[PDB]
């Protein structure tokens, strides 16, 4: 849509998301963080950690950073696509009301978008590089054919949107779902757009769309004002998690008794 | 099994894995490192980073750290369980609705146990407990030839708190009369020490033997000094790809130039 309508609606959605990320730093949240007591010696050496505090610090950073990925994934998928653009999500609730999407053939369809001029496109939204190999491509071809064959008049075409990175090295593999091997030809009904081209596609021709998304996300983060305050909050989150163990796990020099950690986590 | 057999074999398997993890630290491997160009401004502020080098460092850390988890998962699932303790993976008599069950074991006599392997604490909602009980009831219902007992084995974490839900998955219909069948005798959740005991035919100290194998594999790999420099190099390798096109003079990055460059 307009630069400003995209920027502000994204910023709206990403501001929220930023609050949830901030919300994972509470004392109560710390109780949910998991330590695999079998992996601890390996992590301690592979990352050259000096004590238990630094190990806790390291696992927490992964805990948080992984959640950011997972939550951003949900933001893009459930909020940004449907609320900002018109790409409506196929969660179980929506599949029931919207006519025969319920059927398991549509498992791999994440989103429907109906254009101004009547055209409908089904979108299998994916993340990052996502480098699928012959075997997963053959089955994804057979899956898109069964949609186009059994329910032609519900969608004009299917799309596999990859919302970041590129298909510089993965062109041969998408070039099929197309000369050779087990797969029905659907060249003109199934396209793979990645990065800038996914966002251009989603937003019907506006090539700068990806940049308006970034910008909207930049504005939410500036407003949220978290750079100065989070340094303390995250340190506190380590204190909360570490107090759980310190009494029984620590030696006096600050190192961990791995087996005491194990004993305590596994019992 | 015997203390030294569990240690030797676990240690031998953990070496393959440490190797596989070490392989992740080369220049070539740095090209696999993904970066989500939309998420960068957030990671920068949330973790109070000061420049692009600090950003790359943090993403690398997460990349490696999550790789360890994924690789450990496979270590346990494909190597340790089968090759140490004889619980073979259902990789490829079976086929139907055994999606949730992960391994099969054949004890010295002839009992056939069916294992659904779990990782973390493993809290399950009341509804999933009810649903899984239907799946387990429907499995044991038929083929009592190679299904003497089903087990949900939680290889780390305890069952403190979330054990009321386990009893229902097994059968415990009160006045709430949950939609469940009494399979109490043939279906069990063993977590932590009990999983490893159960898995190793009573041997309580099994978990410590597994851990010790891992500690020794790590000690003989001697990766603690050589990795600091390798992971530092790894950051440089990755950062060099973007430095010219994105770096400001103060060390920060022009996010929009990173976006365009990744998504082009």
Domain edge (last residue) among B203, B223, B241: B203
Same domain, B167 and B133: yes
Question: Which residue does chain A place closest to B161, by CA atoms?
Answer: A267
| Contact between B228 and A48 using a beta-carbon 8 Å cutoff | yes
Same domain, B82 and B208: yes
**Domain range for residue A258?**
1-86+207-267
Same domain, B168 and B94: yes
H helix runs in chain A, sequence order: 3-22, 27-30, 40-46, 52-74, 92-97, 134-150, 171-174, 196-202, 209-224, 230-249, 258-265
Distance (Å, whole) CA A41 – CA B220:
12
Domain edge (last residue) among B178, B203, B228: B203
**Residue B263 is nearest to which of A61, A164, A218, comparing CB atoms?**
A164
Q: Under 8 Å CB-to-CB from B3, ≥6 apart: which residues?
A: B205, B209
Same domain, A95 and A165: yes
Same domain, A195 and A98: yes
Q: What is the DSSP string of B78-141?
A: IIIIIIIH--EE------SS-SS--EEEE-SSS-EEEEEEE-S-----HHHHHHHHHHHHHHHH
Total number of domains constituting chain B: 2
CATH of the domain at B253: 1.10.3250.10
The answer to whether residues B53 and B235 touch, using CB atoms and an 8 Å cutoff, is yes
Q: Which of B123, B156, B220, B253 to mutate to test the interface with A (most CBs of A within 10 A)?
A: B156
Same domain, A103 and A154: yes
Q: Could you tell me the sign of the dihedral formed by the alpha carbons of A257, A258, A264, B3, in that order?
A: negative
Same domain, B156 and B123: yes
CATH of the domain at B190: 3.40.1560.10
Same domain, A91 and A192: yes
CA Rg, chain A, in Å? Answer: 23
| Contact between B38 and A221 using a beta-carbon 8 Å cutoff | no
| Contact between A58 and B61 using a beta-carbon 8 Å cutoff | yes
Question: Which residue does chain A place closest to B32, by CA atoms?
Answer: A129
Distance (Å, whole) CA A207 – CA B195:
55
The pairing of strands B112-118 and A111-114 is unpaired
Same domain, A21 and A50: yes
Say which DSSP state A154 is in. Answer: G
Q: Which of A40, A43, A46 to mutate to test the interface with B (most CBs of B within 10 A)?
A: A46
Same domain, B128 and B158: yes
Same domain, A116 and A30: no
Same domain, B162 and B178: yes
Domain edge (last residue) among B165, B183, B203: B203
């Amino acid at each position: 849509m307009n630069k400003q309508e995209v920027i502000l609606k994204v910023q709206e959605c990403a501001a929220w998301w930023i609050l949830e990320r901030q919300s994972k730093l509470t004392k109560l949240m710390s109780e949910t963080m998991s330590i695999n007591p079998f992996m601890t010696p390996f992590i301690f050496d592979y990352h050259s950690l000096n004590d238990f505090d630094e190990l806790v610090e390291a696992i927490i950073a992964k805990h948080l950073m992984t959640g950011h990925d997972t939550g951003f994934g949900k933001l893009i998928d459930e909020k940004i696509l449907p609320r900002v653009f018109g790409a409506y999500k196929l969660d179980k609730s929506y599949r029931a009301a919207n006519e025969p999407f319920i059927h398991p053939c549509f498992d791999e369809i994440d989103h429907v978008i109906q254009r101004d001029d009547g055209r409908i496109e089904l979108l299998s939204l994916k993340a990052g590089k996502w480098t699928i190999q012959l075997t997963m491509a053959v089955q994804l071809n057979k899956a898109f054919h069964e949609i186009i064959n059994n329910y032609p008049g519900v969608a004009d075409n299917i799309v596999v949107g990859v919302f970041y990175g590129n298909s510089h090295g993965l062109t041969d593999k998408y070039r099929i779902l197309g000369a050779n091997h087990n797969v029905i030809d659907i060249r003109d009904k199934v396209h793979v757009y990645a990065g800038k081209e996914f966002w251009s596609w989603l937003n019907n021709g506006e090539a700068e769309t990806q940049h308006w998304v970034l910008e909207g996300i930049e504005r939410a983060v500036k407003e949220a004002d978290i750079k100065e305050k989070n340094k303390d909050l995250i340190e506190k989150f380590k204190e909360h998690v570490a107090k759980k163990y310190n009494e029984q796990v620590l030696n006096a020099d600050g190192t961990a008794q791995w087996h005491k950690l194990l004993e305590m986590i596994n019992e």
